[PDB]
Amino acid sequence: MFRKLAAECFGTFWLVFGGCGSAVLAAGFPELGIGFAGVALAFGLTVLTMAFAVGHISGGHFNPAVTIGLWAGGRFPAKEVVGYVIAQVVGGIVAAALLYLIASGKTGFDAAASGFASNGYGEHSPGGYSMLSALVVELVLSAGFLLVIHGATDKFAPAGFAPIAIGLALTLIHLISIPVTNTSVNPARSTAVAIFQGGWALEQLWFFWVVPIVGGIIGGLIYRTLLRASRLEEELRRRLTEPG
Amino acid sequence: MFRKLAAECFGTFWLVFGGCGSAVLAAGFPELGIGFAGVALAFGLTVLTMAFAVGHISGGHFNPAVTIGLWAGGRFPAKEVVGYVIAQVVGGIVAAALLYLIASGKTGFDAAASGFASNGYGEHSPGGYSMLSALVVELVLSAGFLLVIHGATDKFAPAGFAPIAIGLALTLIHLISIPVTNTSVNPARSTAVAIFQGGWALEQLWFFWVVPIVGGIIGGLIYRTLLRASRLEEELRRRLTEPG
Amino acid sequence: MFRKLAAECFGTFWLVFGGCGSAVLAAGFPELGIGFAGVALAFGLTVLTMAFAVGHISGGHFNPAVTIGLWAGGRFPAKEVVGYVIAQVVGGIVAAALLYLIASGKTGFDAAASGFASNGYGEHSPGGYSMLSALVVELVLSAGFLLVIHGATDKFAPAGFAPIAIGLALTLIHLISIPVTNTSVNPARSTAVAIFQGGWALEQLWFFWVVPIVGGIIGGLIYRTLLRASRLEEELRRRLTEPG
Amino acid sequence: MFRKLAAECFGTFWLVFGGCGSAVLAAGFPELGIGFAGVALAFGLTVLTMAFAVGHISGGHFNPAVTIGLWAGGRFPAKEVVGYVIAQVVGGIVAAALLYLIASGKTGFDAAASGFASNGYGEHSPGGYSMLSALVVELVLSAGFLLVIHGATDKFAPAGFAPIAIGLALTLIHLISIPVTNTSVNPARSTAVAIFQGGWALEQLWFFWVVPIVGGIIGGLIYRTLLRASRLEEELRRRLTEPG
Amino acid sequence: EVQLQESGGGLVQPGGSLRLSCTASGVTISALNAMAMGWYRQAPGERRVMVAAVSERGNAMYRESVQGRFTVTRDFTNKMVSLQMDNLKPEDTAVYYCHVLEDRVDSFHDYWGQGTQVTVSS
Amino acid sequence: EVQLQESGGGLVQPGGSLRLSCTASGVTISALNAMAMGWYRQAPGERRVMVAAVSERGNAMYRESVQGRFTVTRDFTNKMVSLQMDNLKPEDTAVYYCHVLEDRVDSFHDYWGQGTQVTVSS
């Protein structure tokens, strides 16, 4: 469990560092910044690389919503959930701290005024979207993310390709939802930067712990009840694929 | 069949949500929008991830043109075609509806005036291209898409790599054809947004049901008649690869 | 051979259509164009998808320089070279023709004035580079491309991953060299658009038949003489990996 | 060893040529340049393609920090380290030289004034970041890079996918850190361009030989002590996965 | 235990169609709803292999070589399973058995029908 | 050599919980700290297979079919290893053995316990 917790902590640290640092240091650079597309690519690549690196150790969740959705899908023991979550959160926080230090090396940096890549809705949405839009988008994208994770790791899916699918799914989610809420779908990532923003981000933090997790659960349930093959169905397929 | 229909519906929902939402919410964002390249990447990633997730269940078509072209290529039973198509369409519509709701959360949104990422030609083409250009581009790109799908899923192709090839092919198709017609090559995706546009999009909708499907058929025929190896050819290759 | 020639023709058609059409129709679109990065991605994706589709049929060259370099590397029979080249050229030309038609659907199109995505050097280089710079860049990039192709298809390389490596290598080559010469490294692609440009492109066409091919040969030679393992070396490795 | 040294030299040449040439020739092109995101993609693609090409020969390090970190992780013999490093450096230098020649073909080129894509901190940082920020970012990113390399090449990781993970990790590192120090994490790449810059780059070169290497070592140590499974743990897993 | 009674089948020329039916008895509807109902076939001198089935959740599954020509339907209320064969070929000549598969946690249990002859001769 | 003494076990109805314990003797604490401590189980007529273990570094490892219901704990100072079983099932009825695995460079050495009976009957 120590190995697994260390893997989850390092993975979440990598995710937060990569994505949030790309957003804070490079997204708005004059005449050469990477923009929203670059930020989405960075977020996807963090998960892809860290999955390839330590998924064989811990399973590569790096997300409390992912862990809880996998539990709801019947794929992860309940007794191990809490530990995982704690590790993830801790990792994120550490990353944020280091990021803060780095961001302080440039004149004029102000975490409170810039927002420090914090998630928000309504008046604090990047595009000025309402609370209902944020709720709908977060729910749908979390459910889709969990569905993709469940499908790609199924025993009948191509072996070894899951990290690519999951990382590119995260990139797509960011590409879709950055203008609405800043694309959290990850409570630990939201918390890590909300702590250092210190203002309105902490007031709205609860929203990004409830909506993603709920969405993840829904995703798991769907794959558990509508898409996964039952034991009898597996046996039937095996018998139907026998030469005669 | 219920599992397969659910998989197709969810896949088409994912495709429409991802691609059209990226086009509507993030493509034109000031100073940080993702642009045409970002939209093309999102469209490709939706198909890639959904294929990795549920292709082992339903085959991962998510496109009426793909289903009909696979039928014409001798790879999909006719009696199952209609069901698939219906599922796909339904999925798309649902996605569009949710997208509409989300788009309504920002002040000044107007689906009719903006076009809601609808496909069009002539006066309604993004780049002001004529009907003939739209016809030629849609035909060629649909044929190429079906050819790629047939080749990548061939029993002699590398195993497990088909989703990557198909998704990146869709991304390339968008990169090429977005300025001409908005890159439909998918009747369900066109219908989903044309319904909510409610104006000229419905007048031109027929064009994007006929041209793609026909193109797909052509693609299938080509692979069926010029590229697929016959039974005798397979036996000859097997015998030619025997040690002596 | 008919199957192989058809595969090569279709692959070269796909390459030219995709890359040149992305350059001509979408690269310079106002406020949303894909740019040089988008064009490079399109060029890489064409090769990647077409390789996954028909490499098991013809080997997926789609490039006269690739075919000649593979011959020089001791991997392709001489008697089959000429046919392949002809097929490739034919495919490219057809693609260009269709592209021309599509480009004519927009008011103000002028192939001669715009250049029709033709390769050139000196006064006709996109960035105003001299002939020596074009020669050096084309030679180095062609040699590197052939080296990557030889290495990735080696029997000791990971199986099934070659199309990804080759396509991404083409994307990288474009990313590097577009400003200098428009990144030909492919005589057929240069010829297809030079024919329809009809002006200075045909005067400089010879340069893009000699430099790439020579570069390809060099690449092959390197892998043949410095990197490929000899028969004795293969036997030694096999014996050194035996349990005792 | 001659084969391995040649492979390392060619790989480092490819890396420097690709990345630095994309930065120098295409990053700032007016209205169509690839930007920081394009440069990061080019840097990642060089490593990805060269790994797929010659990793089965030499292991595909192309980086002195990678070699030393692999030594510190218990995966690379000490007696072979020095040779590798020399080869890498030599390769880089050659690439830089050729790049210089190419860059001289355009009027107004000035290596000293432009910086020739050299790494720097403080007054010479692209974004005006302090020395402490550069140190922290380089240390963290080098450690993460080495951790990813160790994890992806582990015997329990998916086979054949390591080049993709490593290349995309390099792309992510560039996406994060280009504005701070120009994203060295590679002493050979820094040296190759610092030699031709000839000014402040040589004064600060030491910083980019110490910080990356140290970071790499740390990464190796982590994987060696906290994440790698011991012999007893491997045996326990094998016994726990036995049917009864 | 479960008792399976089949019907239909016989002689048909190539390109014709046939409909086999099978009814179960000796089992309650609720108990049967948790089982799979399908069709096996044995051709002269070969294996007895499954060609089509309907699972406890109503998902129709087919063998690759017969999908597109065979249609398997299940009536849960009537405890009935039927097979419709269209565009018959000489390779379809065989003895067809109604089959029931039951899940017993650690293994599966098979219930077999009597068998019906289907001969496709021009 | 190492001597293993087990305790606990017995009869329990389905859904109940049990706690097995095992203590080692004849070995110093430092020597035992370099070994793995775990639990094997043999069901009637089947293999004797490992279900859970704790490695020399304190990492708890489980068999897939039992993870989520079993919890293995190790006390290094007391040279003790314990197993807690919750939500027991009929398939959990078997003889459970305390096990010690020792690394000998070129091979592994096993130390076995006496065995304890666990029967889950409603």
Place this chain on the structure above:
Amino acid sequence: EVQLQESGGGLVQPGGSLRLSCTASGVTISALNAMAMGWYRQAPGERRVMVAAVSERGNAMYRESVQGRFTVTRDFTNKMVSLQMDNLKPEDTAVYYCHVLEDRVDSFHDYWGQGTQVTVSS
């Protein structure tokens, strides 16, 4: 049935060239057009294995070790198949058989020639 008559072959020094020919009889042109025509070879003490063939659609196929030196041609109207060998090597010494492959739906049928000796000795 099909009757195959071969010709050519004999003695040749290394680096030389030879041309084998084979003609079919007892079969109509239309019937033969639906079959594959090729060449097998057996070297002293080894298998009889295929080296080259032309399928019913006119696609020439080669064994990897001989492609680049052998050229197989088929004349459908004349019911003829020919093999041209250039840059011969000592490993090319063997008995070469004209071969015809026929598709019978559920299996393949082989028609063999008499055989011709090709010896490459310096």
Place this chain on the structure above:
Amino acid sequence: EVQLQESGGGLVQPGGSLRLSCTASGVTISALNAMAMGWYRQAPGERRVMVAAVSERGNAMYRESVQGRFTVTRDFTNKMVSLQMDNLKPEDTAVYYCHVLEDRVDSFHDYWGQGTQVTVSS
């Protein structure tokens, strides 16, 4: 034929170093330059397996378990091959054979040395 004469070896405590040498005779320098020169080793009761070699092009190759401690060198002019062993371990105790591998187109031919004993005992 080729004759191989070895030297060196003997008794060494753990952590020590040794140097084995081997010289070839009865073959011209040009002929030997086209062959590989290496070292096999057989430990008590096990296989005789290759541990290191130098190919005809001068590429040094090692077995995974010995790379980092063994260094194989080849002198083409003197027709000599030497092995340097550092940080020796008990598993290195065995009989070491000088070996020559020759390519014969369709197969490989081995030339063996007499053998030398290397014993690493503390």
Place this chain on the structure above:
Amino acid sequence: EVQLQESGGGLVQPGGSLRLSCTASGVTISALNAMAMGWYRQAPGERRVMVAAVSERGNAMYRESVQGRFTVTRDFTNKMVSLQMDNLKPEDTAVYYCHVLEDRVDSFHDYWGQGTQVTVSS
């Protein structure tokens, strides 16, 4: 445990004779009297196989290919086993190991010697 120390061996021309000896230590005479004492040999690249032995009851046993040339003797009081080889042949060149076999009821246990080289070269 038992410790075996060998002696003798070396170089001998064909037709010569040699005498190997082996002494045991770390075991009482009574305990050793219940064990078998013999000789194994391993030739370059082959198995390590038994050639001769003396059982606990004093019965000398030989391998078929060596009987008539080898004579194995055992001194129980001195805990010694000796082998006399006469009319040596090139196939007798190998490493010879003193061996002790102990009966453990349900299995046998082997004790090995260091090994001695015997080379028969004219």
